[PDB]
């Protein structure tokens, strides 16, 4: 049993908590930190507008929350400097506040007693970035201590981009992700550093940035310089699609693009990348554990220009990818 | 011209700005304070997800925003004592941050040179509380300097309750407001002092508190102890309905209940309370200037139990009410 | 095994089918009728925007759908006169089209071979109307052959009203149900017999009629003349609340109102009526199997005036009530 | 005054009626046909969930609706051949039912007394297809009698594609439109010819086809064979964006792409195509009178791959395009 801490018990933090409880044979979460009281945090754990009710008993007191009879320590320290992970023999910390994506700030978890930190986001100054199934074999357990599990959109794009680039050669590609709103956006028009994410999220199509396409090149260096893109945030609470339009020198058809994905999406990698010929809408991919669900019915080809589309539950899909990365870390030294 | 300042250029602050510009012939907003830069503030002024584009040119610089050629000084002071309302000859400040609903915190504006503060919410320690059309004739220009315009829901409920209580006598009533989500609620499930307002606002029916419950007694003391209620926040961006179920000793019918409203909703008071027999849905009452839009189709009566329903645009409606109150304050002595 | 047919394989029809799979050991759905082809109907069975992916394997051909290896005959007959329920040895028909709530039309199912018809709505000219847990003991297997399971709202209100009426005496009450939109409302402003339900359902609070308050009298005749109310349809896809305000001569407090429900919400009746002190929102009661989930936190009292609020999943909760009624009819002579 | 009839008084029909009142001095709507009674149709005319209250007085009787004192005849004929447009001296019929896009069926309007039919959608067997501002100069008043004003998406894509093809050259391109839901989608999961459009529109991202990029080739024949694409329908009630990714014949920059649009978007053409550097979201382009609002901030370039995005109010903007086309027909023979 490896012991995990969660810093930032938010959408991703609580998705991760439930992913561990539900999916892992060898991890347990034993401490969490947020900015609220235990009555509030247990309530949010127990009841979820997306995931439904937790199917285990949840109690709390002024020190802790107890889930299915297992006591979890709870903190409310804004500054991780004030945490003590070692007091709970915690091995791995998930950094999911959204405020410590700089690895020089996140490393405070290691100063506070943990051996490893996994940032639930694109990072700065990290030791390494990983998309499980794409580049996790380059994980170095001696030297990779504060790592990123990249973004939701990256975990969707990279698996697809790898398969298609390996087979045919991507010359350049531009991406649009049509993406569930997230808590970074405002419910009502209000100040934001991004003037478009300032706008009422549940009644708007909101264009905004994604670092996903260039972040893809962090995990697939061969695609450096070859990808860029943006997001349209739209009114669904979770569930997203990545739409990539790329050129290739190869001779391709709808059928051979789709065959390349189907051929790859098997075995362990097929837990990351699924292939589908179903009449999917976003609600069909909510609570799907894949990082990427390729939608063969949406493939288009015009000359040497290809459009492909892959779905992802930006909460749960991404979380399951992060758990796969976490399991690997836990499988090796420290 | 009486000159007005706005503290907190949010939903209500910007609604208020547009209402003054669109509706008033004798007020001018000349200074605003918020917590952001002028690029951001002027974007949110020009573009609105509810009200649409402002039909006038909007420019900005390091110290101001200019609307239709009229320069508005802008500040970014978290503490209102770092403002100077007197420097721009501002007589009346709208307090619409949501953080200064305690009148003894809102009086920081007076310290900074204002003569009158109107809090855009239920207040504590306030000089007085008004729902325009209901009790504004009680306004005391000498003694009422930091005042409350009450809440959206109160401004909906009190007109209706007054007409009905006056005609038939309300023994007790209990209200449910089915209410648009507001910026106090969370887009995704996240911490909040209210465990239900914590929950994703646009996919949930969310039970919670309403101001109106007890606050009606501030403007209608004869109903102290006789009313209470709550809110169901639901997924519409604006537009709300107050549903009041009450007992009366009077013998009443749907018809006599409706006739009481229709006979009162006339003249000046008709600007606060309207009577409709239209097949209304919430989008029909968005951008309606009334505090309370009585829906005669929804009246029900069973023995001595009565149900009445009134609509309100909890943004614009309330805002037009606050503008009425501001106009009254501006029409009387400012010492 | 009692054999069931479903006329109208819509939201309620398909809920019902899933509920049978999940919750019954003696019923089997063997035939369904709708107005579409089997490719379309099987797709709607498999993929559901509310309930998610059906866990069984689904196939179809030109006259059936096969679910988990069990072949279900499919018809496409607008007029039930053209049905033959006897061909597949059907005992009970669920009438869930919306169009045959007059028992004089729904008895066509009997003439077509069925032994019992359960109308999934308030009916007219019916033999009996039941809310399970309220008046199901009055079911008469000889003489009750075309019956009504009432509405969703009636299954929410009646349990709560029975308990409060029995304990305190309801003089008169008026109800507002704040109700999810349903399929008979319009996505865009468009013709409807009801001028408000004509209006775009997902952007409006839409006032409309409900007979539930007068249908309660069919299952609790002691409340004849003493209840009325209406609905507000709001933009959630399922999940609803009944808000009842009533007068009583009893001396009552919030506490004693709440205690009355808690005391009753036990044993078998408790599978119909639940009692909750949780901080519930509508997503929390999606897929709850109760007809009625009383919210003790929302109880208010002013003198002799009382307001109570009970939740219901107008799809799943109602369906679980209809299945309980079906199970009773199935347990007796047919 | 040229007299207009509207067949199908739905979203587009009623937008058109309002556009005529607001924007025309030489057209008059004098009769309409739908499938409903006049109480219902007058209510829908008066109250609009998107456009708000009509500022004219509306009354009705059993064969008409009166607006601002002007009596409009109302028919309820499912079959166009049972209409008599000569009764009310109608010159031009807007065909906006969705059911008569085949010109061989739409021509029944001509037999019923009209001189010209404008189909508010891509057509089959038509005399000609027009995107105002792009190819309306090819209109032939002798020979073009049953015509199409194309789709919303075509009216958005074609102006932008004309300019970028003229200046830089499109080799091939693939489009995604992120599009408001429309009334042919289902509110609740229900039978539809399209198995995705079957799915609850207000909670899903719904992929579906669009002939729009291939219909561009009808108004810009130089682009025949060079465009394809699809739509994602998303939960906003109106307001859409067309995202085109194309390979350019010449090297370009973001700045030069943006400059080309700004340079062209002037004069009459600029009433069709606008240029924006504003931080736009969908609610900002609701009720905009342009067919295409080019968003300079979303232009991206990687090598010879280019992504451009243009907004459109798929109701009002398209309707303003349709009215421009109507004015042109009205200004000339018959
Ligand atoms: N779809 C998604 O939501 C998604 C997917 C992939 C990655 N991510 C990333 O994961 C991170 C978390 O996003 P989220 O959607 O869960 O955000 P969130 O707002 O839902 O959760 C953040 C949580 O951290 C808490 N918090 C904030 N500052 C804190 C501090 N200093 N100390 C402790 N707790 C603090 C908040 O109270 C909240 O509970 C971000 O970096 C985001 O980009 C999000
Ligand atoms: N929205 C409604 O329906 C509604 C209706 C009636 C009354 N009200 C009341 O009006 C008040 C404002 O509500 P809102 O909906 O406009 O909120 P909001 O969040 O939309 O706006 C608040 C604004 O104040 C600014 N702000 C916050 N703290 C500040 C400070 N210290 N100094 C300066 N600016 C500051 C914020 O940046 C924001 O722009 C609240 O008291 C609320 O109860 C709201
Ligand atoms: N919340 C709810 O959805 C709810 C709850 C309780 C009761 N009900 C009642 O259940 C009934 C069905 O409602 P619903 O929500 O499932 O509606 P729905 O529109 O989802 O389903 C009706 C189904 O019947 C089919 N159909 C229509 N006419 C037909 C005919 N002549 N023959 C065969 N099939 C036909 C349709 O194609 C559709 O699949 C109604 O009476 C409604 O009042 C609905
Ligand atoms: N965004 C848009 O809504 C949009 C944009 C561009 C083009 N269009 C096209 O315009 C047409 C109408 O689309 P809409 O969105 O207005 O649809 P709609 O569903 O809002 O309107 C169609 C109207 O036609 C009526 N109708 C149906 N069959 C009829 C018949 N046989 N005879 C007479 N009336 C009949 C309906 O009752 C309804 O009022 C379609 O061809 C559509 O593709 C729509
Ligand atoms: O949903 C949350 C993502 O991690 C942030 O989105 P993105 O991957 O498009 O940047
Ligand atoms: O909507 C904003 C109101 O002022 C807050 O609602 P309320 O009046 O029900 O408290
Ligand atoms: O959910 C659909 C209902 O059966 C019809 O509404 P109601 O129960 O409120 O009458
Ligand atoms: O909006 C209605 C259109 O006619 C349908 O969309 P489209 O132009 O992408 O086909």
XYZ file of N, CA, C and O in Angstrom, chain B residues 219-330:
448
model
N -40.482 46.942 5.712
C -41.153 47.969 4.932
C -42.656 47.901 5.175
O -43.356 48.830 4.790
N -43.129 46.799 5.778
C -44.537 46.551 6.081
C -44.605 45.980 7.497
O -44.749 44.784 7.687
N -44.470 46.810 8.542
C -44.304 46.284 9.899
C -45.530 45.502 10.342
O -45.420 44.636 11.190
N -46.686 45.760 9.712
C -47.927 45.089 10.066
C -47.844 43.608 9.676
O -48.680 42.802 10.082
N -46.819 43.209 8.918
C -46.641 41.793 8.602
C -45.459 41.187 9.361
O -45.035 40.074 9.062
N -44.940 41.878 10.373
C -43.899 41.277 11.197
C -44.407 39.978 11.801
O -45.509 39.928 12.296
N -43.634 38.902 11.665
C -43.983 37.594 12.184
C -44.977 36.826 11.327
O -45.384 35.725 11.689
N -45.454 37.394 10.221
C -46.536 36.716 9.519
C -46.098 36.072 8.208
O -46.914 35.469 7.506
N -44.833 36.239 7.848
C -44.355 35.748 6.572
C -43.019 35.057 6.794
O -42.241 35.461 7.662
N -42.737 34.067 5.945
C -41.443 33.413 5.924
C -41.366 32.675 4.598
O -42.320 32.650 3.852
N -40.231 32.059 4.300
C -40.084 31.396 3.020
C -38.630 31.153 2.670
O -37.758 31.374 3.516
N -38.414 30.680 1.436
C -37.090 30.237 0.982
C -37.072 30.372 -0.537
O -38.076 30.768 -1.148
N -35.928 30.024 -1.117
C -35.690 30.126 -2.542
C -35.277 28.763 -3.095
O -34.565 27.987 -2.427
N -35.776 28.483 -4.301
C -35.233 27.455 -5.165
C -34.529 28.154 -6.329
O -35.196 28.699 -7.192
N -33.190 28.144 -6.323
C -32.397 28.675 -7.421
C -32.407 27.651 -8.541
O -32.148 26.486 -8.293
N -32.663 28.084 -9.780
C -32.849 27.153 -10.891
C -32.059 27.685 -12.078
O -31.581 28.838 -12.035
N -31.769 26.832 -13.095
C -30.913 27.246 -14.202
C -31.501 28.175 -15.255
O -31.695 27.761 -16.389
N -31.706 29.438 -14.868
C -31.876 30.534 -15.810
C -30.984 31.664 -15.320
O -30.715 31.760 -14.119
N -30.443 32.456 -16.264
C -29.424 33.441 -15.952
C -30.015 34.671 -15.269
O -29.324 35.335 -14.476
N -31.267 35.000 -15.593
C -32.018 36.017 -14.866
C -33.506 35.778 -15.102
O -33.914 35.041 -15.996
N -34.316 36.380 -14.229
C -35.738 36.129 -14.218
C -36.136 35.153 -13.101
O -35.594 34.056 -13.034
N -37.117 35.569 -12.280
C -37.516 34.891 -11.063
C -39.019 35.032 -10.857
O -39.666 35.910 -11.436
N -39.588 34.193 -9.990
C -41.008 34.267 -9.669
C -41.188 34.032 -8.168
O -40.663 33.052 -7.654
N -41.936 34.919 -7.486
C -42.257 34.744 -6.088
C -43.641 34.139 -5.967
O -44.623 34.747 -6.427
N -43.700 32.982 -5.290
C -44.935 32.231 -5.105
C -45.301 32.296 -3.624
O -44.546 31.795 -2.804
N -46.394 33.008 -3.296
C -46.831 33.254 -1.924
C -48.152 32.541 -1.652
O -49.147 32.679 -2.400
N -48.138 31.710 -0.615
C -49.351 31.012 -0.219
C -49.687 31.527 1.167
O -48.836 31.520 2.045
N -50.892 32.069 1.320
C -51.263 32.688 2.572
C -52.699 32.300 2.944
O -53.493 31.849 2.102
N -53.008 32.508 4.233
C -54.360 32.443 4.747
C -54.907 33.829 4.988
O -54.169 34.728 5.392
N -56.225 33.940 4.789
C -56.962 35.149 5.113
C -58.277 34.716 5.758
O -58.775 33.632 5.463
N -58.817 35.576 6.628
C -60.143 35.374 7.194
C -61.215 35.742 6.179
O -62.328 35.282 6.317
N -60.876 36.535 5.155
C -61.836 36.952 4.148
C -62.277 35.783 3.287
O -61.526 34.844 3.016
N -63.537 35.866 2.878
C -64.079 35.070 1.792
C -63.571 35.672 0.470
O -63.784 36.850 0.184
N -62.809 34.880 -0.297
C -62.172 35.379 -1.508
C -62.339 34.344 -2.616
O -62.454 33.168 -2.339
N -62.203 34.788 -3.869
C -62.167 33.921 -5.038
C -60.938 34.279 -5.856
O -60.344 35.330 -5.633
N -60.616 33.446 -6.857
C -59.527 33.794 -7.755
C -59.792 35.192 -8.307
O -58.891 36.042 -8.463
N -61.077 35.458 -8.580
C -61.432 36.668 -9.290
C -61.210 37.893 -8.417
O -60.773 38.946 -8.891
N -61.610 37.799 -7.143
C -61.497 38.963 -6.272
C -60.030 39.213 -5.918
O -59.615 40.364 -5.763
N -59.245 38.138 -5.787
C -57.809 38.319 -5.551
C -57.203 39.087 -6.720
O -56.460 40.040 -6.525
N -57.501 38.642 -7.951
C -56.922 39.243 -9.150
C -57.383 40.695 -9.298
O -56.583 41.591 -9.626
N -58.687 40.933 -9.059
C -59.229 42.282 -9.152
C -58.548 43.238 -8.167
O -58.374 44.393 -8.489
N -58.171 42.804 -6.957
C -57.487 43.690 -6.026
C -56.187 44.182 -6.640
O -55.831 45.349 -6.490
N -55.453 43.282 -7.333
C -54.170 43.682 -7.876
C -54.409 44.639 -9.038
O -53.815 45.712 -9.133
N -55.307 44.245 -9.929
C -55.531 45.077 -11.100
C -55.931 46.495 -10.709
O -55.481 47.444 -11.361
N -56.734 46.658 -9.644
C -57.216 47.990 -9.296
C -56.089 48.783 -8.658
O -56.023 49.987 -8.873
N -55.124 48.123 -8.005
C -54.017 48.863 -7.415
C -52.923 49.179 -8.433
O -52.225 50.169 -8.308
N -52.724 48.311 -9.424
C -51.592 48.479 -10.324
C -51.885 49.517 -11.401
O -52.121 49.144 -12.532
N -51.860 50.798 -11.017
C -52.218 51.927 -11.861
C -51.373 53.105 -11.395
O -50.826 53.097 -10.290
N -51.198 54.104 -12.264
C -50.502 55.312 -11.864
C -49.050 55.036 -11.492
O -48.450 54.080 -11.989
N -48.502 55.863 -10.605
C -47.102 55.752 -10.242
C -46.809 54.340 -9.726
O -45.747 53.789 -10.050
N -47.690 53.837 -8.846
C -47.508 52.559 -8.178
C -47.504 51.422 -9.215
O -46.817 50.420 -9.007
N -48.283 51.593 -10.303
C -48.231 50.785 -11.518
C -46.851 50.614 -12.166
O -46.648 49.682 -12.941
N -45.914 51.521 -11.886
C -44.541 51.390 -12.344
C -43.775 50.360 -11.499
O -42.800 49.801 -11.982
N -44.218 50.126 -10.259
C -43.619 49.148 -9.351
C -44.288 47.787 -9.535
O -43.584 46.772 -9.673
N -45.628 47.785 -9.626
C -46.402 46.567 -9.676
C -47.299 46.580 -10.909
O -48.158 47.446 -11.031
N -47.120 45.565 -11.781
C -47.918 45.362 -12.967
C -48.814 44.163 -12.740
O -48.523 43.305 -11.908
N -49.894 44.128 -13.521
C -50.893 43.086 -13.555
C -50.848 42.496 -14.967
O -51.016 43.238 -15.939
N -50.615 41.189 -15.101
C -50.626 40.526 -16.413
C -51.631 39.381 -16.471
O -51.839 38.650 -15.496
N -52.249 39.228 -17.650
C -53.042 38.065 -18.016
C -52.403 37.404 -19.245
O -53.048 36.584 -19.874
N -51.101 37.627 -19.453
C -50.378 37.073 -20.593
C -49.837 35.682 -20.255
O -49.640 35.330 -19.075
N -49.583 34.822 -21.276
C -49.032 33.503 -20.999
C -47.526 33.560 -20.785
O -46.787 33.036 -21.618
N -47.119 34.155 -19.660
C -45.739 34.539 -19.392
C -44.833 33.332 -19.072
O -45.261 32.408 -18.375
N -43.607 33.340 -19.642
C -42.512 32.484 -19.201
C -41.372 33.431 -18.843
O -41.486 34.642 -19.117
N -40.337 32.919 -18.160
C -39.352 33.799 -17.568
C -38.726 34.749 -18.584
O -38.425 35.927 -18.247
N -38.422 34.255 -19.790
C -37.780 35.106 -20.782
C -38.675 36.288 -21.169
O -38.159 37.282 -21.626
N -39.988 36.228 -20.960
C -40.855 37.368 -21.274
C -40.681 38.536 -20.299
O -41.074 39.667 -20.611
N -40.152 38.281 -19.102
C -40.037 39.339 -18.096
C -38.594 39.789 -17.886
O -38.318 40.748 -17.133
N -37.667 39.206 -18.651
C -36.307 39.716 -18.677
C -36.354 41.142 -19.236
O -37.060 41.380 -20.202
N -35.605 42.059 -18.615
C -35.519 43.485 -18.927
C -36.848 44.228 -18.712
O -37.057 45.290 -19.292
N -37.739 43.707 -17.859
C -38.937 44.427 -17.464
C -38.620 45.329 -16.270
O -38.006 44.883 -15.298
N -39.078 46.592 -16.326
C -38.659 47.613 -15.364
C -39.447 47.510 -14.049
O -39.192 48.283 -13.150
N -40.451 46.638 -13.958
C -41.292 46.549 -12.773
C -40.595 45.767 -11.659
O -39.777 44.905 -11.936
N -40.889 46.122 -10.412
C -40.428 45.347 -9.271
C -41.162 44.013 -9.156
O -40.648 43.051 -8.599
N -42.399 43.978 -9.641
C -43.305 42.884 -9.351
C -44.299 42.830 -10.497
O -44.926 43.846 -10.784
N -44.397 41.668 -11.164
C -45.295 41.466 -12.295
C -46.246 40.333 -11.967
O -45.897 39.146 -12.122
N -47.458 40.706 -11.507
C -48.413 39.760 -10.985
C -49.022 38.941 -12.106
O -49.501 39.486 -13.107
N -49.029 37.624 -11.935
C -49.484 36.753 -13.009
C -50.860 36.215 -12.653
O -50.994 35.352 -11.805
N -51.906 36.760 -13.275
C -53.261 36.514 -12.818
C -53.668 35.095 -13.162
O -54.539 34.539 -12.534
N -53.036 34.516 -14.183
C -53.296 33.142 -14.565
C -52.884 32.125 -13.494
O -53.298 30.982 -13.579
N -52.018 32.474 -12.541
C -51.522 31.467 -11.627
C -52.225 31.549 -10.263
O -51.940 30.738 -9.383
N -53.189 32.474 -10.087
C -53.861 32.608 -8.799
C -54.699 31.366 -8.527
O -55.466 30.909 -9.393
N -54.571 30.828 -7.302
C -55.384 29.711 -6.862
C -55.947 29.974 -5.461
O -55.339 30.674 -4.671
N -57.147 29.433 -5.185
C -57.822 29.619 -3.899
C -58.489 28.297 -3.536
O -59.199 27.747 -4.366
N -58.279 27.834 -2.301
C -58.873 26.609 -1.758
C -59.306 26.938 -0.330
O -58.455 27.304 0.490
N -60.629 26.932 -0.070
C -61.165 27.449 1.188
C -60.633 28.835 1.554
O -60.930 29.807 0.881
N -59.855 28.960 2.646
C -59.269 30.247 2.997
C -57.759 30.278 2.721
O -57.059 31.078 3.308
N -57.267 29.396 1.848
C -55.859 29.312 1.462
C -55.734 29.881 0.038
O -56.465 29.434 -0.858
N -54.790 30.817 -0.167
C -54.627 31.548 -1.426
C -53.193 31.447 -1.950
O -52.283 31.602 -1.155
N -53.004 31.188 -3.263
C -51.671 31.181 -3.855
C -51.621 32.231 -4.971
O -52.539 32.285 -5.807
N -50.613 33.107 -4.891
C -50.415 34.177 -5.858
C -48.951 34.151 -6.272
O -48.055 33.842 -5.464
N -48.720 34.506 -7.533
C -47.387 34.423 -8.097
C -47.044 35.718 -8.820
O -47.813 36.161 -9.641
N -45.857 36.266 -8.581
C -45.422 37.470 -9.260
C -44.013 37.292 -9.812
O -43.106 36.836 -9.111
N -43.814 37.756 -11.036
C -42.511 37.683 -11.690
C -41.688 38.914 -11.361
O -42.248 39.955 -11.026
N -40.377 38.789 -11.584
C -39.436 39.884 -11.520
C -38.132 39.499 -12.214
O -37.643 38.380 -12.032
N -37.574 40.455 -12.970
C -36.205 40.368 -13.419
C -35.386 40.790 -12.222
O -35.317 41.968 -11.929
N -34.813 39.812 -11.512
C -34.058 40.090 -10.279
C -32.856 41.007 -10.538
O -32.346 41.583 -9.588
N -32.410 41.184 -11.800
C -31.425 42.213 -12.107
C -32.122 43.547 -12.400
O -32.006 44.503 -11.629
N -32.733 43.649 -13.581
C -33.189 44.915 -14.117
C -34.333 45.471 -13.263
O -34.396 46.664 -13.050
N -35.288 44.625 -12.899
C -36.445 45.028 -12.124
C -36.034 45.700 -10.823
O -36.455 46.821 -10.514
N -35.199 44.988 -10.076
C -34.652 45.499 -8.844
C -33.898 46.789 -9.119
O -33.999 47.736 -8.375
N -33.108 46.809 -10.185
C -32.344 47.982 -10.533
C -33.234 49.203 -10.790
O -32.896 50.304 -10.312
N -34.322 49.026 -11.555
C -35.256 50.105 -11.796
C -35.888 50.614 -10.493
O -36.034 51.830 -10.321
N -36.126 49.700 -9.536
C -36.617 50.053 -8.217
C -35.595 50.908 -7.471
O -35.956 51.895 -6.843
N -34.326 50.528 -7.536
C -33.254 51.234 -6.866
C -33.090 52.624 -7.483
O -32.771 53.584 -6.770
N -33.225 52.697 -8.809
C -33.205 53.977 -9.505
C -34.364 54.869 -9.025
O -34.162 56.051 -8.755
N -35.548 54.310 -8.828
C -36.656 55.096 -8.291
C -36.315 55.657 -6.920
O -36.491 56.854 -6.665
N -35.780 54.806 -6.046
C -35.362 55.265 -4.741
C -34.273 56.340 -4.834
O -34.325 57.329 -4.109
N -33.325 56.191 -5.753
C -32.241 57.134 -5.917
C -32.772 58.491 -6.382
O -32.291 59.549 -5.936
N -33.709 58.452 -7.319
C -34.389 59.634 -7.814
C -35.050 60.404 -6.663
O -34.960 61.633 -6.605
N -35.760 59.701 -5.776
C -36.402 60.321 -4.619
C -35.380 60.999 -3.703
O -35.547 62.158 -3.300
N -34.311 60.288 -3.374
C -33.220 60.836 -2.563
C -32.616 62.071 -3.247
O -32.268 63.074 -2.618
N -32.461 62.001 -4.560
C -31.915 63.124 -5.290
C -32.909 64.288 -5.392
O -32.496 65.387 -5.713
